[PDB]
RNA sequence: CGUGAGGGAAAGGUGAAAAGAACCCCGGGAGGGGAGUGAAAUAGAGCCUGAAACCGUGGGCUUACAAGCAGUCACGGCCCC
RNA sequence: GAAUGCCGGCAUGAGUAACGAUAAAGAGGGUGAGAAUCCCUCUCGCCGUAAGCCCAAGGGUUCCUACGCAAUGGUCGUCAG
RNA sequence: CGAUGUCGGCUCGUCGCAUCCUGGGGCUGAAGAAGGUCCCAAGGGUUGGGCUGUUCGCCCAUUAAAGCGGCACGCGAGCUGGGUUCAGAACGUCGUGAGACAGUUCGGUCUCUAUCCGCCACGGGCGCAGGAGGCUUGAGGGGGGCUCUUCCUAGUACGAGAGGACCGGAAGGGACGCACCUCUGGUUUCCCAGCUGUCCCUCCAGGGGCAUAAGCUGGGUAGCCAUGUGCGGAAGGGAUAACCGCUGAAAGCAUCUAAGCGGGAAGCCCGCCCCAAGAUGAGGCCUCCCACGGCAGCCGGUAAGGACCCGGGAAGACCACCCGGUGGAUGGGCCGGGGGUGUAAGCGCCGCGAGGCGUUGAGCCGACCGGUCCCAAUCGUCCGAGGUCU
């Protein structure tokens, strides 16, 4: 018996493979399927991902945004079926895995500490060049 | 209810 | 009443109708009946189920005897389900269809010698304002000269966990017969690798 | 996760700026209040000649919390503060504007007026 | 605390009852297949120095 | 509780315990065979095995890695040049533990030998 | 013991005679076992006599469904005479 | 037979509390009847306006060697004030 | 009085019922809704704050309700020590005074070790007439027992209106309880990184010690966790309380009763969950051993089986329990995956330099899921039936 493989066997039906890779520090647009009575629509949540906590099918990522004067953090499961898509809007360069510290920084301070990740940006335009 | 001590507090 | 032996394998959430549902995966199948308890012979009705194959090098003669009289492979675990009499010679997860509610029994995790706070959710003592070495102590345990004793049953520190626990009316979320899995919604007593019993619920 | 003594930002133009919860109106003995729950609170800071003034004992519905709230779809949301909107006994906003985003859980809790007035619902 | 204390002297019967569990268990020993001397199992024989068939130790 | 926790405490705080295994490693790697108490012995295996595996790698990196625990260039040269080659084909198990038959007089401690393998 | 004035104990007995145990044996030694001395050595120096509490070894009878100031009265079983 | 009597002896509590700063230990090699504890080596840790050094009080051979391990040493002891 | 520690709080309960709520009733100056008043009922529940040392009380905000009492005014070998009993000091007052005052003020030594009973846990022993390995029956115990809002029925019955049901159905909560760790959120004593001073290795580079029993800082697996998740209170059957009747005399009528029969509570019995054959009343089933050598007894070897020892374990203080012991994946290594950390060292290139870029999601890397006999569970030993009698 292999209890791990069993779990991954259960999870396998639900696993996504269509989402783009992003890192903590990247700026991201999550189009999420929302219910609002009595219809359902797509609401876009767009911000920096400050956390990606891994656990296989159970990885989840946290995105931070400041809307209308207030800071908002959203936790999304990486394989939720309620995410329509994710668009990478900017590669940001982190020097640590969790970016909790940007919560106390000015927008200007954040801007400095999260320089655009030129390398993975070049990679982004380097792919997308398709036949 | 407050009634008075009958025994002192124990000393060394 | 119907039931099956199984081991707890682990937990996850799956997605079902835009909802995350916490599940515990259980490997239940397959359980061979190795004896039936009958009113004319035993005075009550049940089925002794076997579970998990065993190295015959480890099974002794009185045990070998029992298995053979039932024409059954040597198994690691023997356990009864009461008032359950399957038509077959073998019980599998398929006796459970999704949507059914079940009762899961397992052996709880053992906390060993547990203080009165962990065990019985006592308040313990203050951590300041003069508290003297009593921060986790249970307080008074009685009265005075009347009754001059302590009640049988007084909640006190002592071993806690590693005991039979049944949680009831859990949903069967899915069942994967080709791998002998059962998917139950919520939490189940005990550690991974822990033997558990799964019975149809007694609630209505 | 709001309880008595908790300070809340007020997210409207009632004139209040800071309320301190003195009760969570939810059963015999609720320990915490979250998005969509109504509290009774004391006005601790106001601005001159508002509807409400310092000292008043008003009702409000929580619309933002710093402790993240969980959703049946497996997600969560969390705000920079704990905020509330002051209401009347009919659960109607006493102000005429509400500022900053509010939690979507308000809609299903029957605070449609406030949900509407909000600049964003997350 | 208030300094608890024995209320009554323990009887010869009762102290000895307490000690009904105090007997030593003799050392469990087995012959060393090399030199037939008696030693604890799963230890290197302290007489010839052999364990698992080979010489391991200078005794 | 202690549910599924790996690592003896050996009644030492963090830095003493670390020092303990290191000094043992220096002595094992030096004399090829030492005698300790059974618990230190069993715990010394993996600590040393890892160090031997790095010696089996041979690279400058792995040398600088081992130096963090062993600290002695000569001792490490012995490790890399004479010891590690003996294990080129052996897949783990570079150490063994066999229990002695007699306890310490002064405190009754059960003893064991730990040696590098052939 | 007290700075001091001052307070202030415990502790006797081998044998007639040292004849106070050569020598051998186990043991690092202490101790013991033989040999020897003696009327006597459980008079062997930790020595006359050697009570009692207290500790232990061996044997007889007895005890793990039972209620106690522990005894007493009766009967029965077992052991001994 | 009692005086919370006096003197002494021996019990109970009990193989229990404790073994006196949480600066810290590990291995190898000696020695010896016997070694966690004595010597030597290497590694590790602690003090460094001290936990090092030098005076004065006070103590009085405790100093240095050799030979010892009954007792003293809170364990051990081959070591030692 | 050769000592029965004394108010209040805390902690932990437990009982009573003259019942605060919830359930069931009768009467009502009971239209409905909502009250009053009495009866039955102790199963559960009975909130958070301000003031005072307070008990109490008043007040704020709620609530189904914010019940009253007993237990040495329950509980100081369980804690507190604010109050009241000491020594200090002052004020008012009384006294020539020393001092005093059910008058006030500020301060003021609360004792590591549980023998017996009792309590919570856990073993050892012997017994359960053959000896054993498993699986069970449940005598008898314990646990639990709460409750609100909204919607539908229906703006209906009832009312002029205001207001607004019974019965029946549906959803959603608060507090409590048991388990659990997928998620959320904590811890994670060395799993990774960054930083300072100093000493050191080896000069640079790269490192190690120490700064706490982690030097500091940012993160963090498994585990153990709640703030997170699942689920529970029931349903149902039975017998009842007050109370309501059917039939019905004594008493041509009447009468719930004297014969007899119905209805009827969150309460009582069962039902749910857990313990349980030391239940000496020691039960039941399945399976294994067997008809030993010597003189209901003894000794001696065995049978089936057990223990010893060992490798370990979400088992655990020791013990016990559980697994495994080479015909083996038990721990340790090693390998693969997960996971954390977040791009090592070395070199190259750019810059006067601090650095930066590339190699590179690299290097390192506890516990998590696995594989692999490389290391160690070597080799063994000791117990252990012969079945009493009607
Ligand atoms: Mg496995
Ligand atoms: Mg898993
Ligand atoms: Mg497979
Ligand atoms: Mg995946
Ligand atoms: Mg995957
Ligand atoms: Mg600027
Ligand atoms: Mg590039
Ligand atoms: Mg005292
Ligand atoms: Mg599905
Ligand atoms: Mg039946
Ligand atoms: Mg039956
Ligand atoms: Mg049936
Ligand atoms: Mg079971
Ligand atoms: Mg604890
Ligand atoms: Mg705890
Ligand atoms: Mg608990
Ligand atoms: Mg408290
Ligand atoms: Mg606390
Ligand atoms: Mg105190
Ligand atoms: Mg104190
Ligand atoms: Mg304290
Ligand atoms: Mg008391
Ligand atoms: Mg009594
Ligand atoms: Mg247990
Ligand atoms: Mg339970
Ligand atoms: Mg059951
Ligand atoms: Mg349900
Ligand atoms: Mg605002
Ligand atoms: Mg004001
Ligand atoms: Mg007001
Ligand atoms: Mg104390
Ligand atoms: Mg005593
Ligand atoms: Mg006595
Ligand atoms: Mg006595
Ligand atoms: Mg006693
Ligand atoms: Mg005796
Ligand atoms: Mg006793
Ligand atoms: Mg051998
Ligand atoms: Mg702990
Ligand atoms: Mg483990
Ligand atoms: Mg461990
Ligand atoms: Mg381990
Ligand atoms: Mg460690
Ligand atoms: Mg251990
Ligand atoms: Mg310790
Ligand atoms: Mg300790
Ligand atoms: Mg210790
Ligand atoms: Mg130590
Ligand atoms: Mg340190
Ligand atoms: Mg050597
Ligand atoms: Mg490893
Ligand atoms: Mg080092
Ligand atoms: Mg040993
Ligand atoms: Mg041993
Ligand atoms: Mg020995
Ligand atoms: Mg010793
Ligand atoms: Mg003197
Ligand atoms: Mg003197
Ligand atoms: Mg003198
Ligand atoms: Mg004399
Ligand atoms: Mg004479
Ligand atoms: Mg004379
Ligand atoms: Mg000799
Ligand atoms: Mg000699
Ligand atoms: Mg000597
Ligand atoms: Mg002699
Ligand atoms: Mg002699
Ligand atoms: Mg003679
Ligand atoms: Mg003669
Ligand atoms: Mg004569
Ligand atoms: Mg003689
Ligand atoms: Mg003699
Ligand atoms: Mg005599
Ligand atoms: Mg004599
Ligand atoms: Mg004489
Ligand atoms: Mg004499
Ligand atoms: Mg004598
Ligand atoms: Mg005598
Ligand atoms: Mg005797
Ligand atoms: Mg009886
Ligand atoms: Mg009897
Ligand atoms: Mg008796
Ligand atoms: Mg008794
Ligand atoms: Mg009596
Ligand atoms: Mg009698
Ligand atoms: Mg007298
Ligand atoms: Mg006397
Ligand atoms: Mg006395
Ligand atoms: Mg006297
Ligand atoms: Mg005396
Ligand atoms: Mg004594
Ligand atoms: Mg002991
Ligand atoms: Mg004791
Ligand atoms: Mg103790
Ligand atoms: Mg101790
Ligand atoms: Mg000391
Ligand atoms: Mg002392
Ligand atoms: Mg010490
Ligand atoms: Mg210490
Ligand atoms: Mg230190
Ligand atoms: Mg120590
Ligand atoms: Mg030596
Ligand atoms: Mg020699
Ligand atoms: Mg020594
Ligand atoms: Mg010695
Ligand atoms: Mg040494
Ligand atoms: Mg020493
Ligand atoms: Mg020492
Ligand atoms: Mg060395
Ligand atoms: Mg210092
Ligand atoms: Mg200095
Ligand atoms: Mg200094
Ligand atoms: Mg000097
Ligand atoms: Mg002098
Ligand atoms: Mg002197
Ligand atoms: Mg001298
Ligand atoms: Mg000389
Ligand atoms: Mg000595
Ligand atoms: Mg000595
Ligand atoms: Mg000696
Ligand atoms: Mg001498
Ligand atoms: Mg000594
Ligand atoms: Mg001392
Ligand atoms: Mg000597
Ligand atoms: Mg000397
Ligand atoms: Mg000297
Ligand atoms: Mg008195
Ligand atoms: Mg007294
Ligand atoms: Mg008295
Ligand atoms: Mg209080
Ligand atoms: Mg307390
Ligand atoms: Mg308190
Ligand atoms: Mg409190
Ligand atoms: Mg009571
Ligand atoms: Mg009560
Ligand atoms: Mg009470
Ligand atoms: Mg009344
Ligand atoms: Mg009231
Ligand atoms: Mg009512
Ligand atoms: Mg009522
Ligand atoms: Mg009424
Ligand atoms: Mg009415
Ligand atoms: Mg009316
Ligand atoms: Mg009316
Ligand atoms: Mg009345
Ligand atoms: Mg009344
Ligand atoms: Mg009344
Ligand atoms: Mg009543
Ligand atoms: Mg009640
Ligand atoms: Mg009651
Ligand atoms: Mg009550
Ligand atoms: Mg209160
Ligand atoms: Mg205040
Ligand atoms: Mg208060
Ligand atoms: Mg009060
Ligand atoms: Mg009153
Ligand atoms: Mg008052
Ligand atoms: Mg008043
Ligand atoms: Mg009401
Ligand atoms: Mg109140
Ligand atoms: Mg009242
Ligand atoms: Mg009360
Ligand atoms: Mg009372
Ligand atoms: Mg009273
Ligand atoms: Mg009291
Ligand atoms: Mg009271
Ligand atoms: Mg008391
Ligand atoms: Mg006290
Ligand atoms: Mg008190
Ligand atoms: Mg007492
Ligand atoms: Mg206590
Ligand atoms: Mg005061
Ligand atoms: Mg004063
Ligand atoms: Mg006057
Ligand atoms: Mg005057
Ligand atoms: Mg006058
Ligand atoms: Mg007076
Ligand atoms: Mg006075
Ligand atoms: Mg006064
Ligand atoms: Mg007074
Ligand atoms: Mg007075
Ligand atoms: Mg007054
Ligand atoms: Mg006044
Ligand atoms: Mg005062
Ligand atoms: Mg003061
Ligand atoms: Mg005072
Ligand atoms: Mg006071
Ligand atoms: Mg005080
Ligand atoms: Mg003790
Ligand atoms: Mg005791
Ligand atoms: Mg105690
Ligand atoms: Mg007693
Ligand atoms: Mg007891
Ligand atoms: Mg047991
Ligand atoms: Mg037992
Ligand atoms: Mg027992
Ligand atoms: Mg026993
Ligand atoms: Mg018997
Ligand atoms: Mg039998
Ligand atoms: Mg078994
Ligand atoms: Mg059995
Ligand atoms: Mg059995
Ligand atoms: Mg039966
Ligand atoms: Mg029963
Ligand atoms: Mg009973
Ligand atoms: Mg309608
Ligand atoms: Mg309507
Ligand atoms: Mg109307
Ligand atoms: Mg209307
Ligand atoms: Mg109608
Ligand atoms: Mg009308
Ligand atoms: Mg209306
Ligand atoms: Mg209804
Ligand atoms: Mg509900
Ligand atoms: Mg309760
Ligand atoms: Mg967990
Ligand atoms: Mg996990
Ligand atoms: Mg977690
Ligand atoms: Mg987390
Ligand atoms: Mg964290
Ligand atoms: Mg490391
Ligand atoms: Mg460090
Ligand atoms: Mg440094
Ligand atoms: Mg140097
Ligand atoms: Mg450098
Ligand atoms: Mg460096
Ligand atoms: Mg380090
Ligand atoms: Mg250093
Ligand atoms: Mg350090
Ligand atoms: Mg230092
Ligand atoms: Mg600090
Ligand atoms: Mg840390
Ligand atoms: Mg975390
Ligand atoms: Mg973790
Ligand atoms: Mg919670
Ligand atoms: Mg449900
Ligand atoms: Mg019913
Ligand atoms: Mg009925
Ligand atoms: Mg009538
Ligand atoms: Mg009639
Ligand atoms: Mg008639
Ligand atoms: Mg009748
Ligand atoms: Mg009658
Ligand atoms: Mg009836
Ligand atoms: Mg009727
Ligand atoms: Mg109910
Ligand atoms: Mg059971
Ligand atoms: Mg049984
Ligand atoms: Mg039985
Ligand atoms: Mg049973
Ligand atoms: Mg009975
Ligand atoms: Mg019988
Ligand atoms: Mg039986
Ligand atoms: Mg069976
Ligand atoms: Mg035979
Ligand atoms: Mg014969
Ligand atoms: Mg056999
Ligand atoms: Mg074991
Ligand atoms: Mg455990
Ligand atoms: Mg163990
Ligand atoms: Mg033991
Ligand atoms: Mg076994
Ligand atoms: Mg074997
Ligand atoms: Mg092999
Ligand atoms: Mg393995
Ligand atoms: Mg392995
Ligand atoms: Mg990764
Ligand atoms: Mg780089
Ligand atoms: Mg690099
Ligand atoms: Mg340049
Ligand atoms: Mg250059
Ligand atoms: Mg690349
Ligand atoms: Mg790598
Ligand atoms: Mg890896
Ligand atoms: Mg891990
Ligand atoms: Mg995995
Ligand atoms: Mg593994
Ligand atoms: Mg092998
Ligand atoms: Mg294989
Ligand atoms: Mg035998
Ligand atoms: Mg007959
Ligand atoms: Zn041998």
Swiss-Prot record, chain C:
GO terms for molecular function: rRNA binding; structural constituent of ribosome. It comes from the Bacteria. Signal peptide: none annotated. Coiled coil: none annotated. Pfam families: Ribosomal_L3. It comes from Thermus thermophilus (strain ATCC 27634 / DSM 579 / HB8). GO terms for biological process: translation. Part of the 50S ribosomal subunit. Forms a cluster with proteins L14 and L19. The keyword Cell division does not apply. This is Large ribosomal subunit protein uL3. The mass differences between the observed and calculated masses are suggested to be due to methylation, which is known to occur in the E.coli and R.palustris orthologs. GO terms for cellular component: cytosolic large ribosomal subunit. Keywords: Methylation, Ribonucleoprotein, Ribosomal protein, RNA-binding, rRNA-binding. PROSITE patterns: RIBOSOMAL_L3. One of the primary rRNA binding proteins, it binds directly near the 3'-end of the 23S rRNA, where it nucleates assembly of the 50S subunit. InterPro entries: Ribosomal_uL3, Ribosomal_uL3_bac/org-type, Ribosomal_uL3_CS, Transl_B-barrel_sf. Belongs to the universal ribosomal protein uL3 family. PANTHER family: 50S RIBOSOMAL PROTEIN L3 (PTHR11229), LARGE RIBOSOMAL SUBUNIT PROTEIN UL3C (PTHR11229:SF16).
Curated annotation (Swiss-Prot), chain D:
GO terms for cellular component: cytosolic large ribosomal subunit. Coiled coil: none annotated. Keywords: Ribonucleoprotein, Ribosomal protein, RNA-binding, rRNA-binding. GO terms for molecular function: large ribosomal subunit rRNA binding; structural constituent of ribosome. It holds the Pfam family Ribosomal_L14. InterPro entries: Ribosomal_uL14, Ribosomal_uL14_bac-type, Ribosomal_uL14_CS, Ribosomal_uL14_sf. Gene3D superfamilies: Ribosomal protein L14. SMART domains: Ribosomal_L14 (SM01374). GO terms for biological process: translation. This protein binds directly to 23S ribosomal RNA. Contacts the 16S rRNA of the 30S subunit in two different positions helping to form bridges B5 and B8. HAMAP family: Ribosomal_uL14. PANTHER family: 50S/60S RIBOSOMAL PROTEIN L14/L23, LARGE RIBOSOMAL SUBUNIT PROTEIN UL14M. Part of the 50S ribosomal subunit. Contacts protein L19. Forms a bridge to the 30S subunit in the 70S ribosome, contacting the 16S rRNA. Belongs to the universal ribosomal protein uL14 family. This is Large ribosomal subunit protein uL14. It comes from Thermus thermophilus (strain ATCC 27634 / DSM 579 / HB8). The gene is rplN.
Curated annotation (Swiss-Prot), chain E:
GO terms for biological process: translation. Residues 1-22 have a biased composition (Basic residues). Keywords: Ribonucleoprotein, Ribosomal protein. NCBIfam families: rpmF_bact (TIGR01031). Part of the 50S ribosomal subunit. Belongs to the bacterial ribosomal protein bL32 family. Found on the solvent side of the large subunit. This is Large ribosomal subunit protein bL32. It comes from Thermus thermophilus (strain ATCC 27634 / DSM 579 / HB8).
From Swiss-Prot, chain F:
Pfam families: Ribosomal_L17. The lineage of its organism: Bacteria, Thermotogati, Deinococcota, Deinococci, Thermales. Part of the 50S ribosomal subunit. Contacts protein L32. GO terms for cellular component: cytosolic large ribosomal subunit. Disulfide bonds: none annotated. This is Large ribosomal subunit protein bL17. Gene3D superfamilies: Ribosomal protein L17. Belongs to the bacterial ribosomal protein bL17 family. The gene is rplQ. Signal peptide: none annotated. Keywords: Ribonucleoprotein, Ribosomal protein. GO terms for molecular function: structural constituent of ribosome. GO terms for biological process: translation.
